[PDB]
Design a protein around this ligand. Structure first.
Ligand code: CLA
Ligand code: CLA
Ligand code: CLA
Ligand code: CLA
Ligand code: CLA
Ligand code: CLA
Ligand code: CLA
Ligand SMILES: CCCCCCCCCCCCCCCC(=O)OC[C@H](COP(=O)(O)OC[C@@H](O)CO)OC(=O)CCCCCCCCCCCCCCC
Ligand SMILES: CC1=C[C@H](O)CC(C)(C)[C@H]1/C=C/C(C)=C/C=C/C(C)=C/C=C/C=C(C)/C=C/C=C(C)/C=C/C1=C(C)C[C@H](O)CC1(C)C
Ligand SMILES: CC1=C[C@H](O)CC(C)(C)[C@H]1/C=C/C(C)=C/C=C/C(C)=C/C=C/C=C(C)/C=C/C=C(C)/C=C/C1=C(C)C[C@H](O)CC1(C)C
Ligand SMILES: CCCCCCCCCCCCO[C@@H]1O[C@H](CO)[C@@H](O[C@H]2O[C@H](CO)[C@@H](O)[C@H](O)[C@H]2O)[C@H](O)[C@H]1O
Ligand SMILES: CCCCCCCCCCCC(=O)O
Lengths: 84, 213, 227, 39, 219, 75, 222
């Protein structure tokens, strides 16, 4: 399984979604989005403390991991359905 | 201060430890009212005395049945007595209901009106039916030895012993009914079967008490 | 102060060192009640003396009669002459009457201290009885109580506690190996790595029951070992 | 207990108990004396 | 201190409770408008009770297999924890002195006495030290905290006489208990996944870690 | 802004005192019957929780407990 | 009988919950007004977890028992549900994909589970009802969809949606202000919520009647 197409696609999807939110390209627990899909500050009630310089909390890790897993599953099943 | 049924919980306000065998056991508040509590005290005393007589008779008959004396079991004694002796069952029922009706009616009207049976309307007897307390009918007939009219502390101790023995006898009668309904044998037969092998002959192995066993 | 049963532990308030052999040991608080404490002291003294007698009897019996098992010595067929195959009913009657008399006298002495010291038949024959559980007089004809009774009482209670533990050790050793204490010690000395509690445990050498003449007496081990 | 007995003494509870008793009596009479048409 | 901490939990988590690492993202210890069972006293008490029960459970679930691997106990014993009679469909042991239901009834009476008296000391502090219990009430007085009763028996060797020593030992107890709780969860998950004992899983994983893990045990 | 569990402890005492006083939930029905209309009113306003009081919290609590009673009946 | 006893236990728990929540621990008004959290839980937890649990029961109990029933096996000879749930040999014989365990689910090899998760459609020619493999796969898809839907609203973290913001952002030139004040209306009036819920609930019941006669889902129902 290691090195296969499914493993590589899933790892790339998770890494891409985690790297987008960390470098100010995807919604996070600290930055929300307006109606014009523009990043704006949020008002999180929890206020998860994080030593990360960009304020990346564990909630962001879970959200990005779930989104990346959904994207990777969809891509893998889509490629398997078209013969690729 | 006094020991209660469930340690740590305060006893109810309607149970102040004055009655015999008071442990503050009334979670449903059945005897919260004073008159209802008095009626229930007499009911518990009658139940305990009848259960004590029943338990003693069952134990004695079972003892005679276990040894070669020819005694029958308690669940067959009625049939054996009615068939062995030419005794008509409805006649015995009527006689018992007549005697019990007279005694219970006198006790009932004495509960409604204390000391009313001491007027002498029953063959001239007066002091024999005056009644000492509720559920405790002292006198020369019910207490010929006079244990209730001497040494008050001993009388209170005997009251506690009576109510505790009555409750234990009620539990014993319930156990007799459940044991006969489950095992189908006599109480001493169950005791002997348990003494023969206590680790494998109990309610957890009878196949009726625990259905998932 | 006296040495307690553990370093750093605090003795209870009721254990101030008055009684002999006090180590401030009471994890269950059973000695909180003074009356209960006195009764438990009498019970401990009785257990101590009976256990010392039992341990000494087992050891002397194994030394003098090594061919007789102490666990099965109670059987009527194992009794010495002329008590062999004797009726156990009369023996139990003798012991019951004598022990009942002496124990009722001791119990009455506990209930009312210094009230049964005098002999009920021959007047004038009394025992001093300075403390409960220590009658003296005819019970101590050698006169060893006219000295340091505290250290002697401490020695007595300590030897009794050790004998209690030792007697229970003898019972479990016999129930797990089927031999007496000296036989078990010799068997362990023959091969310590082969004969010990690691392998002897789990086996109950005591039978299910024994037929003593006419009636059967049920028997069991202290733990559920293999019969 | 007094309040509970007072609640049991209300019109719907009393009507329910009374009608259950009357219905049970009529049902038991028709059970032990099946098909009664005339006296 | 731990991951997942937040300013919301730090408002009521000042470090007074043992094992307070500021980990409460769900806000279960908020004293404002708290009631029922979701309140600081019951939650802390339940955590220490689970900690002690899980410590006993982890040690008892791994002890027979480890002792059987060393030859200390015979082969008739040394069975998996889920095959000792707990779950009869998974396996049962017939070498006990009685059937499991008889022993279960004994456990019912024993556990009811212990647990109900413990509950009464929690509901009414010190109520277990007055009513007669064959002289055992002298050690059931407890203390202010229901989670730490102490006394001549619960604190047999009088350990942690100093306040700092008691705090240190309490932190050690809660950490060991949390580790044991995670171990019990792992024991159950490994029992459902591999169908073998925890010690056997550890040995198989130590023999070949790449080919013996949760990834290779899926199929 | 913060989603948490906000609960009040022991707001209503469990007792049978109100079981013997029909129409206690309504201020007009608590006086007692004078005409038969009252009886019908007693059943026409039993579940009208917003009519008994204007407190939204009390109405919500009554609705939530009534939902539990309904689920018990269904079970 | 066991289900009846469990239902009685659940009824006792429901009544105890109502009493406990009215006399012992009553929730505050702010707790009832958490529409975002309530919707997240009802979508994900209640609906999604219920569909997932029912899918698990169908995959492990309904499918093998009903397969043996349709094959002509007597109900007494059919293995008990716990026997089917305890060993992989019986399930592997009835469904070969069970021989690989849950490994194809994690390796994204879902196509291997095509023996018990199909798209047959139509009806079972033996029983006249819908294929239980289709219903199991249906509940699996429903569970995943509802679990995804249960992570849309904002509760205590930055991620999620605020229904008030969504309602206020929808405003056209033909409707004036729009949905302003609708969030306050639905979070403070129980009658408005009851009206919406009753309307959709009745419409759903009618849809259920139509779909149930047209596509009979139970065996020997049509
Ligand atoms: C690499 C990108 C990629 C590719 C090539 C595919 C390709 C495919 N996907 Mg897919 N998908 C992707 C990414 C991708 N997906 C991602 C990122 C997600 C989100 C997780 C999804 C979620 C998804 C779902 C939920 C489904 C598909 C489905 C399908 C297949 C349907 C073909 C079609 O014409 O639909 C149909 C055309 C229509 C007009 C139908 C529309 C009618 C509705 C009711 C409106 C197809 C082979 C379907 C499937 O399972 O395959 C059979 C399906 O159910 N995909
Ligand atoms: C402390 C936990 C513990 C528990 C719960 C058990 C439980 C059991 N053991 Mg065991 N045992 C233990 C520790 C334990 N053992 C240790 C540490 C040793 C090494 C000395 C042994 C050596 C041992 C042997 C040799 C045998 C058992 C056997 C048994 C079973 C029969 C009961 C019996 O009376 O045998 C023995 C009772 C004891 C050993 C008392 C346990 C003493 C512990 C340490 C007190 C704490 C039983 C289920 C028997 C068996 O397997 O059945 C066929 C058996 O033959 N055990
Ligand atoms: C006012 C109309 C009416 C009348 C006069 C009757 C009369 C009768 N019905 Mg009927 N019935 C009616 C309406 C009526 N019914 C309706 C509306 C229904 C539908 C619910 C029924 C359904 C019905 C059924 C199913 C049956 C009857 C039966 C009977 C007979 C039973 C007699 C009895 O109860 O034993 C005697 C009752 C007593 C002795 C009670 C006496 C009261 C106290 C205890 C004594 C005091 C007396 C001094 C009786 C002749 C039964 C029958 O057998 O038919 C012949 C029977 O099977 N009825
Ligand atoms: C409409 C359903 C409902 C709702 C919305 C609530 C809501 C609430 N309840 Mg409650 N309760 C309910 C039903 C409900 N309950 C029922 C039916 C019972 C009877 C069993 C109870 C008995 C109850 C008690 C005794 C208490 C509450 C408490 C609470 C409050 C906080 C605790 C909590 O639930 O958080 C989270 C829940 C937990 C931490 C415990 C969950 C543990 C269960 C066993 C999880 C499994 C449940 C799940 C359905 C089963 C999964 C299937 C499984 C086989 C895999 C909260 C406002 C507490 C309170 O008053 O706080 C102020 C409290 O003490 N409830
Ligand atoms: C035995 C325990 C108990 C006791 C003593 C009380 C006592 C009280 N409750 Mg309470 N409650 C309980 C359990 C209890 N409750 C339970 C289990 C629930 C959950 C359902 C509630 C939920 C609840 C609410 C929401 C309210 C009360 C209120 C009250 C107070 C006055 C109302 C009243 O009781 O009148 C008596 C009312 C009845 C006897 C009606 C009973 C209706 C039951 C639940 C449904 C029966 C269904 C029926 C069988 C089906 C209909 C079919 C038909 C043909 C028969 C009172 C002090 C009210 C209050 O405090 O006023 C401000 C309040 O609104 N309770
Ligand atoms: C995953 C979490 C969860 C679940 C499963 C539920 C489930 C339910 N809720 Mg609830 N709710 C939740 C979270 C949850 N809620 C939260 C977080 C809030 C606060 C924002 C609320 C606030 C709320 C309100 C105000 C109401 C409900 C109601 C209901 C019931 C609707 C009746 C129905 O048709 O369903 C089908 C019926 C069943 C499936 C019966 C099975 C019930 C079991 C016990 C599952 C319940 C699980 C739930 C989490 C309780 C566990 C807590 C624990 C302490 C016991 C239902 C059982 C209504 C209600 O009160 O009903 C009593 C209602 O009025 N909920
Ligand atoms: C809610 C739905 C649900 C549930 C409950 C289950 C449950 C189960 N499935 Mg399943 N499945 C489902 C949905 C579900 N499935 C769906 C939707 C699909 C389609 C993709 C499948 C397809 C599927 C396949 C193909 C297989 C299973 C299998 C299994 C069984 C073993 C799972 C496993 O392999 O290890 C999983 C490990 C765990 C879940 C961890 C267990 C956690 C334990 C319980 C923790 C306990 C800890 C506790 C502290 C212990 C202490 C005890 C105390 C008394 C001291 C299991 C009983 C296998 C099987 O049955 O073999 C025949 C199998 O082959 N399932
Ligand atoms: C169908 C036409 C939909 C009409 C439609 O939705 O057009 C679209 C139009 C656009 O509305 P807005 O752009 O203001 O909507 C924005 C906000 O409402 C939030 O989306 O809505 C209206 O015109 C409202 C007037 C009612 C339209 C009156 C028509 C009455 C016919 C009713 C019966 C139809 C058969
Ligand atoms: C208190 C309370 C209150 C709260 O609130 C709640 C609750 C918990 C409910 C409670 C409790 C209760 C109870 C427990 C009850 C029980 C009772 C009983 C058991 C009775 C019996 C009772 C019992 C009894 C009398 C019995 C008696 C008996 C008898 C006579 C017998 C007789 C006989 C004999 C000799 C023999 C012959 O051959 C036969 C006969 C003829 C048969
Ligand atoms: C912190 C936090 C915070 C936030 O905010 C919220 C949340 C998230 C919720 C959280 C978390 C939590 C958690 C993690 C939990 C978990 C728990 C557990 C795991 C438990 C267990 C627990 C566990 C336990 C008790 C266990 C126990 C056990 C036992 C007894 C056992 C026993 C036994 C033995 C010995 C052996 C044999 O052969 C078997 C038996 C008989 C069986
Ligand atoms: C999501 C968690 C919450 C739901 C919990 C579900 C767990 C239910 C508890 C009952 C568990 C039954 O789980 C059962 O595990 C055993 C483990 O031996 C598997 O058993 C199978 O595989 C194992 C190896 O893994 C073999 O040794 C065994 O002979 C074979 O039957 C079953 O295929 C599975 O059905
Ligand atoms: C179901 C979602 C439909 C989304 C419609 C997108 C409308 C795009 C125009 C947005 C106008 C704006 O953001 O100012």
């Amino acid at each position: 399984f290691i090195g296969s197409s499914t493993n590589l696609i899933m790892v790339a999807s998770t890494t891409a979604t985690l790297a987008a939110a960390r470098f100010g390209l995807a919604p996070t627990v600290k930055k929300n989005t307006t109606a014009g899909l523009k990043l704006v500050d949020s008002k999180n009630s929890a206020g998860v403390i994080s030593n990360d310089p960009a304020g990346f909390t564990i909630v962001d890790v879970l959200a990005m991991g779930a989104a990346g897993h959904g994207l990777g599953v969809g891509i893998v099943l889509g490629l398997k359905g078209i013969g690729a | 201060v006094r020991p209660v049924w469930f340690p740590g919980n305060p006893p109810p306000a309607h149970l102040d430890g004055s009655l015999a065998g008071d442990y503050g056991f009334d979670p449903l508040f059945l005897g919260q009212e004073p008159q209802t509590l008095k009626w229930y005290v007499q009911a518990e005393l009658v139940h305990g005395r009848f259960a004590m007589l029943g338990a003693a008779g069952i134990i004695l008959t079972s003892i005679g049945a276990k040894v070669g004396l020819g005694f029958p079991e308690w669940y067959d004694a009625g049939k054996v007595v009615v068939e062995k002796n030419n005794i008509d069952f409805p006649t015995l029922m009527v006689i018992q209901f007549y005697l019990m009706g007279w005694a219970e009616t006198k006790r009932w009207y004495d509960f409604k009106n204390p000391g009313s049976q001491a007027d002498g309307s029953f063959l001239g007897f007066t002091e024999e039916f005056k009644g000492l307390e509720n559920g405790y009918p002292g006198g020369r007939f019910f207490d010929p030895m006079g244990l209730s009219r001497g040494d008050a502390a001993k009388y209170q101790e005997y009251k506690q012993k009576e109510v505790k023995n009555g409750r234990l006898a009620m539990i014993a009668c319930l156990g007799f009914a459940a044991q006969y309904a489950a095992t189908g044998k006599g109480p001493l037969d169950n005791l002997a079967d348990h003494l023969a092998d206590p680790n494998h002959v109990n309610f957890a192995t009878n196949g009726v008490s625990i259905p998932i066993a | 102060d006296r040495k307690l049963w553990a370093p750093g532990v605090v003795a209870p308030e009721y254990l101030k060192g008055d009684l002999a052999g006090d180590y401030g040991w009471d994890p269950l608080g059973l000695g909180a009640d003074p009356t209960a404490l006195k009764w438990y002291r009498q019970s401990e003294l009785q257990h101590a003396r009976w256990a010392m007698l039992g341990v000494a009897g087992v050891l002397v019996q194994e030394i003098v009669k090594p061919d007789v098992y102490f666990y099965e010595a109670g059987l009527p067929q194992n009794l010495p002459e002329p008590f062999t195959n004797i009726n156990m009913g009369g023996l139990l009657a003798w012991e019951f009457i004598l022990m009942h008399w002496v124990e009722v006298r001791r119990w009455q002495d506990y209930k009312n201290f210094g009230s049964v010291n005098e002999d009920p038949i021959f007047k004038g024959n009394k025992v001093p009885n300075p403390e409960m559980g220590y009658p003296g007089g005819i019970f101590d004809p050698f006169g060893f109580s006219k000295g340091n009774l505290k250290e002697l009482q401490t020695k007595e209670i300590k030897n009794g506690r050790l004998a209690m533990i030792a007697y229970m050790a003898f019972i479990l050793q016999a129930q797990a190996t089927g031999k007496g204490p000296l036989a078990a010690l010799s068997a362990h000395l023959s091969n310590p790595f082969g004969n010990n509690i690691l392998k002897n445990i789990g086996t109950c050498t005591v039978p299910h029951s024994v037929d003593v003449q006419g009636l059967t007496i049920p028997l069991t081990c202290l733990w559920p070992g293999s019969q | 207990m007094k309040d509970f007995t007072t609640y049991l003494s209300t019109a719907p509870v009393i009507a329910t108990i009374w009608f259950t008793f009357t219905a049970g009596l009529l049902i038991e009479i028709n059970r032990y004396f099946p098909d009664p048409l005339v006296f | 201190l731990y991951v997942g901490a937040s300013q919301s939990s730090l408002a009521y988590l000042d470090g007074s409770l043992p094992g307070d690492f500021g980990f409460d993202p769900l806000g279960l210890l908020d004293p404002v408008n708290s009631g029922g069972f979701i309140e600081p006293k019951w939650l802390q008490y339940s955590e220490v009770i689970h900690a002690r029960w899980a410590m006993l459970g982890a040690a008892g679930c791994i002890a027979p297999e480890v002792l059987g691997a060393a030859g200390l106990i015979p082969d008739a014993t040394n069975i998996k924890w889920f095959e000792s009679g707990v779950i009869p469909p998974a396996g049962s042991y017939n070498g006990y002195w009685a059937d499991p239901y008889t022993i279960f009834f004994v456990e019912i009476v024993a556990m009811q006495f212990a647990e109900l008296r413990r509950l009464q000391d929690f509901r009414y502090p010190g109520s277990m030290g007055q009513q007669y219990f064959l002289g055992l009430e002298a050690i059931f007085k407890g203390s202010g905290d229901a989670a730490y009763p102490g006394g001549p028996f619960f604190n047999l060797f009088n350990l942690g006489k100093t306040e700092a020593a008691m705090k240190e030992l309490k932190l050690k107890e809660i950490k060991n208990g949390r580790l044991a709780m995670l171990a019990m969860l792992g024991y159950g998950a490994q029992a459902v996944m591999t169908g073998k004992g925890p010690f056997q899983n550890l040995v198989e994983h130590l023999a070949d870690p790449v080919n013996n893990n949760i990834l290779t045990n899926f199929g | 802004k913060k989603v948490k569990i906000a609960v009040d402890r022991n707001p209503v005492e469990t007792s049978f005192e109100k079981w013997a006083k029909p129409g206690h939930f309504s201020r007009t029905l608590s006086k007692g019957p004078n005409t038969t209309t009252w009886i019908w009113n007693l059943h026409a306003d039993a579940h009208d929780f917003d009519s008994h009081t204007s407190d939204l919290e009390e109405i919500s609590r009554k609705v939530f407990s009534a939902h539990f009673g309904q689920l018990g009946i269904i079970f | 009988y066991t289900t009846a006893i469990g239902g009685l236990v659940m009824a006792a728990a429901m009544f105890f919950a109502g009493w406990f929540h009215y006399h012992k621990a009553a929730p505050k008004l702010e707790w009832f007004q958490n529409v975002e959290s309530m919707l997240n839980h009802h979508l994900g937890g209640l609906l999604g977890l219920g569909s997932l649990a029912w899918a698990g029961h169908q995959i492990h109990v309904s499918l093998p028992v009903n397969k043996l029933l349709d094959a002509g096996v007597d109900p007494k000879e059919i293995p008990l549900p716990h026997d089917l749930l305890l060993n992989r040999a019986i399930m592997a014989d009835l469904y070969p994909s069970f021989a690989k365990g849950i490994a194809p689910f994690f390796t994204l090899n879902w196509s291997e589970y095509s023996d018990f998760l199909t798209f047959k459609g139509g009806l079972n020619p033996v029983t006249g009802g819908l294929w239980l493999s289709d219903t199991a796969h249906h509940h699996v898809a429903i569970a995943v969809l509802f679990l995804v839907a249960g992570h849309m609203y904002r509760t205590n973290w930055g991620i999620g949606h605020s229904m008030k913001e969504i309602l206020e952002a929808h405003r056209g030139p033909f409707t004036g202000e729009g949905h302003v004040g609708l969030y306050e209306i639905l979070t403070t009036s129980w009658h408005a919520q009851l009206a919406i819920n009753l309307a959709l609930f009745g419409s759903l019941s009618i849809i259920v009647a139509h779909h149930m006669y047209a596509m009979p889902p139970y065996p020997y129902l049509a």
